[PDB]
């Protein structure tokens with residue numbers, strides 16, 4: 001006859017967080033392979049007792065009283081589960097020792113012995129003891145002792161972003177100096193100290209292209225890309241009219257129809273070292289302005305961050321240049337024969353221009369004017385050429401002309 005009770009395997013300690021659900025499994029086997037009952041109960045009561053408290057601890061066995069439910073390979077599984085009430089205590093006495101018994105098909109039941117037989121300890125802990133908040137990226141403010149409401153909202157957002165595994169219903173408050181209090185649904189809390197959340201914004205925005213000269217070719221549309229970042233990574237305004245003198249040159253550039261575009265000026269995180277704020281200046285220096293010593297505009301630009309720290313006016317220049325500096329003419333594919341190198345005919349000059357034009361398509365601007373001189377050399381005149389600023393190239397006669405006179409005897 002089967003005279004042996006079943007074997008019960010279960011965790012000795014189960015940590016349950018106040019307000020959340022818990023669940024774990026009891027595994028029961030017997031030598032006979034069959035178990036008829038699994039029970040969870042308080043230690044007190046008679047041998048036949050099934051009384052268990054509190055009401056929220058629950059349990060269930062899905063396959064009781066069947067052959068093969070309880071062997072080494074197909075153990076009987078009992079689910080113990082429930083939801084800890086939201087107002088439960090979390091003091092050292094907020095724990096529960098409950099006893100587990102099993103009975104086989106021949107009636108052998110496991111022994112029940114206070115503090116000695118099969119049992120688990122259910123310990124109730126606050127939700128804060130389950131989570132460890134990640135420190136956020138620093139938020140830079142005007143005054144670390146007295147944050148504004150947009151500073152507080154900026155800290156909360158950066159704490160939320162670094163902690164996406166905190167409970168959905170967690171509430172957050174930021175103190176006057178930035179100290180973050182995370183409050184969990186059970187009322188337990190957590191604090192991020194001001195040192196890890198905020199700092200007084202002390203450094204103004206950096207103009208990366210300080211002292212740069214951007215070459216604009218007269219008569220050709222060009223662009224200049226200006227770069228700024230900030231330690232906060234946020235820039236709220238770029239100013240080109242800081243003082244009367246900067247306001248005048250800048251106003252002069254707008255008169256020529258230049259535009260100034262900063263597409264990400266109203267966005268957050270728009271100005272970091274890696275991904276800097278970009279101002280693009282776009283326009284054409286007309287040919288009426290000549291290149292040379294005074295062919296330039298000196299600008300002073302200032303940028304401000306969200307803490308209102310404005311930088312000291314910094315400098316860049318637009319520098320005018322002639323189209324000749326940018327282009328280099330191709331030589332024609334063959335020379336043109338001339339009866340007299342001293343003085344080319346009209347037809348001779350015409351064939352030369354045809355070949356020089358044909359060799360430069362895709363290289364020089366389509367509206368370049370070629371002047372074939374009397375000696376067969378070629379003046380290339382670019383569209384921006386003016387008396388006050390010449391923009392021309394020369395192709396020498398030895399690249400365009402071939403003597404066709406016969407040789408002596």
Ligand SMILES: CC(=O)N[C@@H]1[C@@H](O)[C@H](O[C@@H]2O[C@H](CO)[C@H](O)[C@H](O[C@]3(C(=O)O)C[C@H](O)[C@@H](NC(C)=O)[C@H]([C@H](O)[C@H](O)CO)O3)[C@H]2O)[C@@H](CO)O[C@H]1O
Pocket residue numbers: 042043044053054092093094095096097098114115
């Ligand atoms: C049989 C014998 O010699 N003596 C027992 C005596 O031990 C028993 O006291 C209960 O015994 C169990 C034994 O596992 C625990 O020690 C009970 O204490 C705890 C628990 O851990 O379950 C303490 C805990 O702080 C309490 N939790 C809370 C939130 O207060 C619980 C809780 O009150 C109980 O689980 C109630 O359901 O008790 C200990 O009380 C008593 C039986 O009453 O006397 C002999 O039977």
Ligand SMILES: CC(=O)N[C@@H]1[C@@H](O)[C@H](O[C@@H]2O[C@H](CO)[C@H](O)[C@H](O[C@]3(C(=O)O)C[C@H](O)[C@@H](NC(C)=O)[C@H]([C@H](O)[C@H](O)CO)O3)[C@H]2O)[C@@H](CO)O[C@H]1O
Pocket residue numbers: 244245246248249250252289294295296297298299300
């Ligand atoms: C503020 C002070 O103490 N005195 C200012 C004096 O600085 C200012 O003179 C202008 O200063 C700016 C600097 O902000 C430039 O240096 C101006 O010179 C140039 C330039 O911008 O490089 C010279 C250049 O040849 C000019 N380019 C042209 C004509 O193509 C330009 C251009 O005329 C201006 O940028 C147009 O605004 O100027 C220099 O004139 C004067 C005038 O604002 O006011 C005093 O009070």
Ligand SMILES: [Ca+2]
Pocket residue numbers: 002003004005006030031032104108
């Ligand atoms: Ca047995």
Ligand SMILES: [Ca+2]
Pocket residue numbers: 127128129130131132133189190
């Ligand atoms: Ca915590």
Ligand SMILES: [Ca+2]
Pocket residue numbers: 140201202203204205230231232305307309
């Ligand atoms: Ca700053």
Ligand SMILES: [Ca+2]
Pocket residue numbers: 323324325326327328329392393
């Ligand atoms: Ca040239």
